């Protein structure tokens, strides 16, 4: 099917306590593959998936240069944005950056992304056309003007439509055992009385890949969405994911309930009934 590559940068000012911290990670779909931490001892971009380890030194040296120059850039920008928002030099603040590309089943470019936040909020984003920018506020309008004058969009577009997509295809081919495998969820139900008259039905999905899944509860074929407790999809720690959905049911009326499980790795959706 379709695939993504995304890089996530976070830079945090720590006033008085020296240089800002910069962390970088890269993902292909829901599999992390690289990292960089300005605080760590290596001062190198590092592998975090088996299939990226085969890249030679020139790949690692270039990638390390890129994140270092980014961390330096963010260092200057943290100051600039403090200026724009009239903030004291005493607060901690945060620049976040997400960029990347998607490709289709055939490997062709689908889209590209670049979006920037300040303190957890939209700051500036590249529009889907890869030609213009959307500023969230007055401060980011100033940034936008610098980026228009500097032709930043053209530079970003050339990356997203070229290198981004080429390397994504390469990583998809070199990691095809792990990246292109679908792990279906392994399902079961749990059941606990709350009272003599009321019981929790909890529907479990485990060991699935990728993260995307849908779990729904139904009574007599009718959706129960308002009365369903759902947890966020969570990493097992081994590359796969977990999720559950629970309903509180009248003791004795369990047979009316059905959990429905949808996932890419399932030929057909599963139905579970206690």
């Amino acid at each position: 099917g379709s695939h993504s590559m995304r890089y996530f940068y976070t830079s945090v000012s720590r006033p008085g306590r020296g240089e800002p911290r910069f962390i970088a990670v890269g993902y292909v779909d829901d599999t992390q593959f690289v990292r960089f931490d300005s605080d760590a001892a290596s001062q190198r971009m590092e592998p975090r998936a088996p299939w990226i380890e085969q890249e030679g030194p020139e790949y690692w040296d270039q990638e390390t240069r890129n994140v270092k120059a980014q961390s330096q850039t963010d260092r200057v920008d943290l100051g600039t944005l403090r200026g724009y928002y009239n903030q004291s030099e005493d607060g901690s603040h945060t620049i976040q950056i997400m960029y990347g590309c998607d490709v289709g089943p055939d490997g062709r470019f689908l889209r590209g992304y670049r979006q920037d936040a300040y303190d957890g909020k939209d700051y500036i984003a590249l529009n889907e056309d890869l030609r213009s920018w959307t500023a969230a506020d007055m401060a980011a309008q100033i940034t936008k003007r610098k980026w228009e004058a500097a032709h930043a969009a053209e530079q970003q577009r050339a990356y997203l439509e070229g290198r981004c997509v080429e390397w994504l295809r390469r990583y998809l081919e070199n990691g095809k055992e792990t990246l292109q495998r679908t792990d279906p969820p392994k399902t079961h139900m749990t059941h606990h009385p709350i009272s003599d008259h009321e019981a929790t039905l909890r529907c479990w999905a485990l060991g699935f890949y990728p993260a995307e899944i849908t779990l729904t509860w139904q009574r007599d074929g009718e959706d129960q969405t308002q009365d369903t407790e759902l947890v966020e999809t969570r990493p097992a720690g081994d590359g796969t994911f977990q999720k559950w959905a629970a309903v509180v049911v009248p003791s004795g009326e369990e047979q009316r309930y059905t959990c429905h499980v949808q996932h890419e790795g399932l030929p057909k959706p599963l139905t579970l009934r206690w």
Binding site: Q70, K146, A150
Partner: peptide, 7 residues
């Protein structure tokens, strides 16, 4: 990865 731009 991609290459920096200033704000």
């Amino acid at each position: 990865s991609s290459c920096p731009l200033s704000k």
